[PDB]
Amino acid sequence: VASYDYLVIGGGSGGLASARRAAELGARAAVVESHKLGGTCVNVGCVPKKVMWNTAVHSEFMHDHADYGFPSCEGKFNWRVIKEKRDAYVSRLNAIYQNNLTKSHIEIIRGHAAFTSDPKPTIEVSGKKYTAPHILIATGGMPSTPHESQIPGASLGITSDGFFQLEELPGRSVIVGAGYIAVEMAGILSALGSKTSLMIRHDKVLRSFDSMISTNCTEELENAGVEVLKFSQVKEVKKTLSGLEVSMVTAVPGRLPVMTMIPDVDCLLWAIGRVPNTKDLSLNKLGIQTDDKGHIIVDEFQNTNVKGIYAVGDVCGKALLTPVAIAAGRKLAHRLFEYKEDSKLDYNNIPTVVFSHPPIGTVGLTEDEAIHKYGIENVKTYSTSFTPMYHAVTKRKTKCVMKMVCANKEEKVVGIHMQGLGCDEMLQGFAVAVKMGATKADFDNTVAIHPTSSEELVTLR
Amino acid sequence: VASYDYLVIGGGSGGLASARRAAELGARAAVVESHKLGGTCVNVGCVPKKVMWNTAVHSEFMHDHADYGFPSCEGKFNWRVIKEKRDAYVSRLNAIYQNNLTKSHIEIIRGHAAFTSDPKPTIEVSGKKYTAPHILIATGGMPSTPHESQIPGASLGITSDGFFQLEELPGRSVIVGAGYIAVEMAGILSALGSKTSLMIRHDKVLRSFDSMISTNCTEELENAGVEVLKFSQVKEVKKTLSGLEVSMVTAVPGRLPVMTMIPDVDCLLWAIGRVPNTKDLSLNKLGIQTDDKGHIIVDEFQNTNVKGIYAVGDVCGKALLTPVAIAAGRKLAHRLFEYKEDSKLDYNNIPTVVFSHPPIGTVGLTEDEAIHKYGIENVKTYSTSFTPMYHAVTKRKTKCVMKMVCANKEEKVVGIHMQGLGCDEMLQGFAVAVKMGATKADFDNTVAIHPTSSEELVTLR
Numbered sequence: 001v002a003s004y005d006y007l008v009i010g011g012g013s014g015g016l017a018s019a020r021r022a023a024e025l026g027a028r029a030a031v032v033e034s035h036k037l038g039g040t041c042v043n044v045g046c047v048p049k050k051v052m053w054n055t056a057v058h059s060e061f062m063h064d065h066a067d068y069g070f071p072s073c074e075g076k077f078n079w080r081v082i083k084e085k086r087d088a089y090v091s092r093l094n095a096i097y098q099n100n101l102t103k104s105h106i107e108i109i110r111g112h113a114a115f116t117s118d119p120k121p122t123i124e125v126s127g128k129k130y131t132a133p134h135i136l137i138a139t140g141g142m143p144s145t146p147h148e149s150q151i152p153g154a155s156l157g158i159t160s161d162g163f164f165q166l167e168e169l170p171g172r173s174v175i176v177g178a179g180y181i182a183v184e185m186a187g188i189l190s191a192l193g194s195k196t197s198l199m200i201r202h203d204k205v206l207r208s209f210d211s212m213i214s215t216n217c218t219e220e221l222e223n224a225g226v227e228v229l230k231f232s233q234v235k236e237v238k239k240t241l242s243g244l245e246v247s248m249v250t251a252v253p254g255r256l257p258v259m260t261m262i263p264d265v266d267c268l269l270w271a272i273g274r275v276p277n278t279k280d281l282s283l284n285k286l287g288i289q290t291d292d293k294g295h296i297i298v299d300e301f302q303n304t305n306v307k308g309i310y311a312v313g314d315v316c317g318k319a320l321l322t323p324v325a326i327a328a329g330r331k332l333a334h335r336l337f338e339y340k341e342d343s344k345l346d347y348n349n350i351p352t353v354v355f356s357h358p359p360i361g362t363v364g365l366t367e368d369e370a371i372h373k374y375g376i377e378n379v380k381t382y383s384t385s386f387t388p389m390y391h392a393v394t395k396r397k398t399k400c401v402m403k404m405v406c407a408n409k410e411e412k413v414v415g416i417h418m419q420g421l422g423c424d425e426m427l428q429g430f431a432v433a434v435k436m437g438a439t440k441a442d443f444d445n446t447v448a449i450h451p452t453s454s455e456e457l458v459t460l461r
Numbered sequence: 462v463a464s465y466d467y468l469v470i471g472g473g474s475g476g477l478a479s480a481r482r483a484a485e486l487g488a489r490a491a492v493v494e495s496h497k498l499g500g501t502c503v504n505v506g507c508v509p510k511k512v513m514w515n516t517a518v519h520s521e522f523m524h525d526h527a528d529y530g531f532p533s534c535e536g537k538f539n540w541r542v543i544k545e546k547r548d549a550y551v552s553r554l555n556a557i558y559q560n561n562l563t564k565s566h567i568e569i570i571r572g573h574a575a576f577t578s579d580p581k582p583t584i585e586v587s588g589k590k591y592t593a594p595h596i597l598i599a600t601g602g603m604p605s606t607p608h609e610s611q612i613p614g615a616s617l618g619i620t621s622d623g624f625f626q627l628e629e630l631p632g633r634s635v636i637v638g639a640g641y642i643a644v645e646m647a648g649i650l651s652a653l654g655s656k657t658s659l660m661i662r663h664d665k666v667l668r669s670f671d672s673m674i675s676t677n678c679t680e681e682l683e684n685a686g687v688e689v690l691k692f693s694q695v696k697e698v699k700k701t702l703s704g705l706e707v708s709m710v711t712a713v714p715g716r717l718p719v720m721t722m723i724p725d726v727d728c729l730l731w732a733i734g735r736v737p738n739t740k741d742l743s744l745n746k747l748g749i750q751t752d753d754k755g756h757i758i759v760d761e762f763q764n765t766n767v768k769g770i771y772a773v774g775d776v777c778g779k780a781l782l783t784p785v786a787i788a789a790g791r792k793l794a795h796r797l798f799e800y801k802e803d804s805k806l807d808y809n810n811i812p813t814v815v816f817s818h819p820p821i822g823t824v825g826l827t828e829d830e831a832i833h834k835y836g837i838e839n840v841k842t843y844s845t846s847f848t849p850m851y852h853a854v855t856k857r858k859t860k861c862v863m864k865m866v867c868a869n870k871e872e873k874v875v876g877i878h879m880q881g882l883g884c885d886e887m888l889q890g891f892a893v894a895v896k897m898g899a900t901k902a903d904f905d906n907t908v909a910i911h912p913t914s915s916e917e918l919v920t921l922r
């Protein structure tokens with residue numbers, strides 16, 4: 001039984017960040033990884049998604065070429081070209097992260113870890129045992145898929161994982177789900193030329209975001225040529241002579257249900273949820289608490305219910321973002337190796353960008369949430385809607401919407417919501433100000449930058 | 462003699478903003494304008510520049526088309542197309558601003574104003590006299606040009622004003638100056654295909670910015686194909702059979718001066734400075750103080766040395782930006798019409814974006830300025846240099862540089878400097894945080910947004 005100061009299970013964002021910080025503090029750490037380092041962020045998430053987004057962005061801008069005095073650009077996107085370059089870039093990152101571990105003197109244990117029956121928390125990887133007074137579980141999650149028992153033929157569809165394996169642009173694609181990943185995929189496929197449908201169970205996408213964003217976002221998708229099938233769900237899928245055939249039930253409220261067949265589907269993409277990766281850990285051998293979805297339960301300091309066992313990131317099922325896993329993993333290392341007992345991540349005011357077209361940036365409370373938190377009488381919002389200067393000369397148009405949620409008399413800024421060109425790079429610094437507890441006067445007292453979209457947030461009235 | 466509560470001379474940013482705010486407060490105001498409403502911002506500055514920038518941006522992105530899996534885009538930019546659309550957009554703004562005045566019940570007095578000999582401050586416009594207990598001078602400035610006496614043939618070159626009148630893309634262009642406007646013009650002309658030279662008196666452009674920016678900016682220009690003629694100046698200009706011929710002296714220190722002729726120049730653009738527009742105001746009839754450049758002298762509350770006469774904007778020659786004139790004009794109206802005596806603009810921490818390629822964002826103190834203000838021992842900087850993810854797949858490259866200047870033990874953030882893709886929209890919110898007095902811990906305690914360029918500023922080490 002080889003002993004370490006810190007044993008990290010999972011080599012993704014959370015696991016890598018925590019191990020690296022602990023190593024700086026003097027800990028002798030090891031990272032167990034069964035697949036590729038970089039985990040979801042590098043291999044099948046953040047990075048490859050962003051590259052594909054940059055690609056779709058090129059597609060749109062190329063529609064405006066003629067308006068801007070250039071000659072029309074004629075044609076066919078070649079998926080294999082960018083696919084090959086994207087994969088290579090991912091290969092470059094795997095090698096970098098491996099190097100990052102080595103230079104820090106972190107040992108890399110390759111293989112699948114599982115807890116043992118042993119009294120003091122001990123894991124086994126490929127017959128060998130390993131132990132540490134501090135063990136971090138950061139196994140992330142995976143895409144959820146329907147059971148054939150509930151939706152026959154479900155296994156004919158792919159997930160975001162399968163998306164990153166595609167070698168050609170699908171002619172006809174149907175995306176099922178209404179969350180950010182669904183929105184993202186539909187927008188990329190559609191910009192690149194796939195005939196795309198997005199199938200949602202209600203009337204709007206991103207229903208957990210501020211209602212101004214869910215509304216605007218659903219409209220922007222339609223305007224960009226994505227067919228949004230509202231109040232619809234898949235009843236069954238089947239392999240026809242040429243592609244798939246999707247049976248769906250549409251049940252608009254105040255109406256009779258109607259069954260529709262969607263034929264000649266090349267790609268059926270499930271974007272319905274993510275499941276934690278805890279199933280093969282043997283948690284129960286130590287009685288580690290999970291919820292009924294398999295998520296590991298932790299307190300505010302990332303402690304599990306077992307002493308010296310912690311969990312961070314997607315496996316805990318809260319705020320499923322790379323920077324959250326990183327920050328929680330870092331704070332945890334300072335708590336354990338620097339004896340900072342108050343060291344923990346504040347889960348409020350975490351900013352999010354959704355890579356739609358145009359992109360979405362959000363931080364803090366939605367209008368409804370502030371209304372529930374402070375009372376209708378104590379909530380004031382400010383908002384604007386405009387056409388970015390970029391489109392002053394284009395026939396194609398996109399809008400920019402911004403909303404500021406204030407609370408109390410002081411008008412403390414408790415939430416910012418926007419969609420528009422530039423919003424992806426604009427959010428970060430306002431998130432700093434929101435975190436610091438700025439009020440509307442703080443915003444108003446900052447001189448504007450002209451001409452930009454960003455200045456709109458500092459000149460709201 | 463028609464009397465008003467507030468008389469505003471000049472219908473640009475400063476004048477329009479002040480008059481509109483005063484009118485909201487109940488003032489009976491009039492705006493005197495001899496040309497077009499919107500002044501420099503609308504007609505020959507901010508707006509038309511930004512449109513041209515968006516156009517040059519299209520040019521660059523179109524170089525990356527093939528890398529991104531698209532077919533190569535072949536050719537010739539048509540200047541007249543965008544020029545016509547740009548002019549129309551400007552026409553649309555003039556009509557909007559005129560309307561904005563009308564709905565506010567602001568009278569518009571068309572013509573050129575000049576002060577009279579009359580005891581109580583009174584102006585005359587086209588034979589009629591006008592008076593008010595409060596008179597704002599917001600006449601802006603103009604491009605500076607050399608005297609034929611010092612540089613023979615100087616009058617063959619054009620200014621940024623003339624740039625907005627060009628009907629065709631110049632084949633060969635030479636820009637003289639090292640300030641933001643010079644940088645901006647060279648970058649637009651060069652991206653659009655003009656064979657461009659930028660002639661500077663020293664070794665770097667933007668010498669008043671942080672040295673990290675002046676260095677990076679000069680390098681980025683060279684990389685983008687702009688020829689930067691260092692330590693050079695124009696000795697004479699002459700009209701040859703086909704274009705202009707520019708005689709220049711190059712005087713590199715540690716070297717002998719060398720005279721060079723630049724032949725076949727289509728466009729010689731002077732971007733050497735701006736002069737205040739006070740020459741035809743008859744200031745001396747009231748003894749209003751100016752400096753030796755003709756700028757109006759004011760105190761911290763925009764008061765001139767004469768009671769009930771104020772000045773804002775470019776004519777005062779400090780922080781020559783549209784949003785500064787606007788903010789100072791607004792604060793002044795609240796002081797005069799809302800009796801807020803402490804109402805004034807703080808000229809510290811004003812943010813600036815330079816529309817280069819890639820764009821520049823700056824706010825607060827340069828490294829040298831903080832060193833002079835707090836002492837070497839009390840200044841700590843953090844910086845980074847990286848290649849934006851956008852270029853992970855392109856053969857063409859641009860860099861992103863960021864620098865944070867901290868002061869004292871607390872590490873208060875006193876200056877932020879960056880250049881890179883997205884920097885134009887990224888600056889605003891960090892400028893809010895800087896204004897509020899954030900420290901490095903405030904930045905560090907804000908969760909990052911991945912993957913973006915913006916996150917680099919919150920994860921500096």
Ligand SMILES: Cc1cc2nc3c(=O)[nH]c(=O)nc-3n(C[C@H](O)[C@H](O)[C@H](O)COP(=O)(O)OP(=O)(O)OC[C@H]3O[C@@H](n4cnc5c(N)ncnc54)[C@H](O)[C@@H]3O)c2cc1C
Nearest residue numbers: 010012013014034039040045113139140313314320321322
């Ligand atoms: C398509 C997609 C797009 C996304 N886009 C973004 C985005 O733009 N921005 C953003 O912030 N977030 C984004 N996310 C979410 C972000 O990727 C995740 O929140 C983040 O990767 C979670 O990190 P983690 O460390 O919890 O887990 P992971 O990164 O999943 O790491 C888990 C690791 O543990 C390994 N492992 C699992 N079990 C074991 C075991 N028993 N033994 C050994 N190794 C094991 C796995 O192989 C893996 O490498 C996206 C996610 C997806 C799916």
Ligand SMILES: Cc1cc2nc3c(=O)[nH]c(=O)nc-3n(C[C@H](O)[C@H](O)[C@H](O)COP(=O)(O)OP(=O)(O)OC[C@H]3O[C@@H](n4cnc5c(N)ncnc54)[C@H](O)[C@@H]3O)c2cc1C
Nearest residue numbers: 471473474475495500501506574600601774775781782783
């Ligand atoms: C090429 C260029 C690009 C720029 N780009 C930017 C940018 O991107 N962002 C930014 O923030 N700033 C930019 N600026 C600077 C910004 O335009 C100026 O700071 C701003 O317009 C100054 O406003 P103002 O009200 O002082 O004067 P102006 O806007 O010049 O207004 C002066 C007005 O007074 C009128 N007038 C003058 N004298 C009289 C008189 N005697 N009687 C009647 N009317 C009179 C003039 O016709 C004019 O309309 C740019 C400037 C230029 C030249």
Ligand SMILES: *SC[C@H](NC(=O)CC[C@H](N)C(=O)O)C(=O)NCC(=O)O
Nearest residue numbers: 012013016017041042046322911920
């Ligand atoms: S996609 C890989 C992830 N990288 C990042 O999110 C960048 C993080 C910043 N550079 C930072 O906070 O320092 C990832 O998994 N990173 C793990 C890591 O240790 O950086």
Ligand SMILES: *SC[C@H](NC(=O)CC[C@H](N)C(=O)O)C(=O)NCC(=O)O
Nearest residue numbers: 450459473474477478502503507783
């Ligand atoms: S280019 C014309 C200028 N407009 C702006 O700078 C936008 C200002 C913001 N909308 C704001 O601060 O409200 C300009 O000269 N504006 C004058 C005005 O009164 O808005």
Ligand SMILES: N[C@@H](CCC(=O)N[C@@H](CS)C(=O)NCC(=O)O)C(=O)O
Nearest residue numbers: 386387388389390451452453455557
């Ligand atoms: N600031 C935003 C919006 C554009 C903007 O600033 N527009 C001004 C002209 S400079 C406008 O349309 N003003 C008209 C009005 O007052 O509504 C951007 O640059 O996209």
Ligand SMILES: N[C@@H](CCC(=O)N[C@@H](CS)C(=O)NCC(=O)O)C(=O)O
Nearest residue numbers: 096847848849850851912913914916
């Ligand atoms: N955040 C910036 C920089 C890109 C970035 O985040 N790169 C990471 C990969 S996700 C990297 O190269 N890491 C290598 C390292 O640790 O230096 C952007 O998105 O452009």
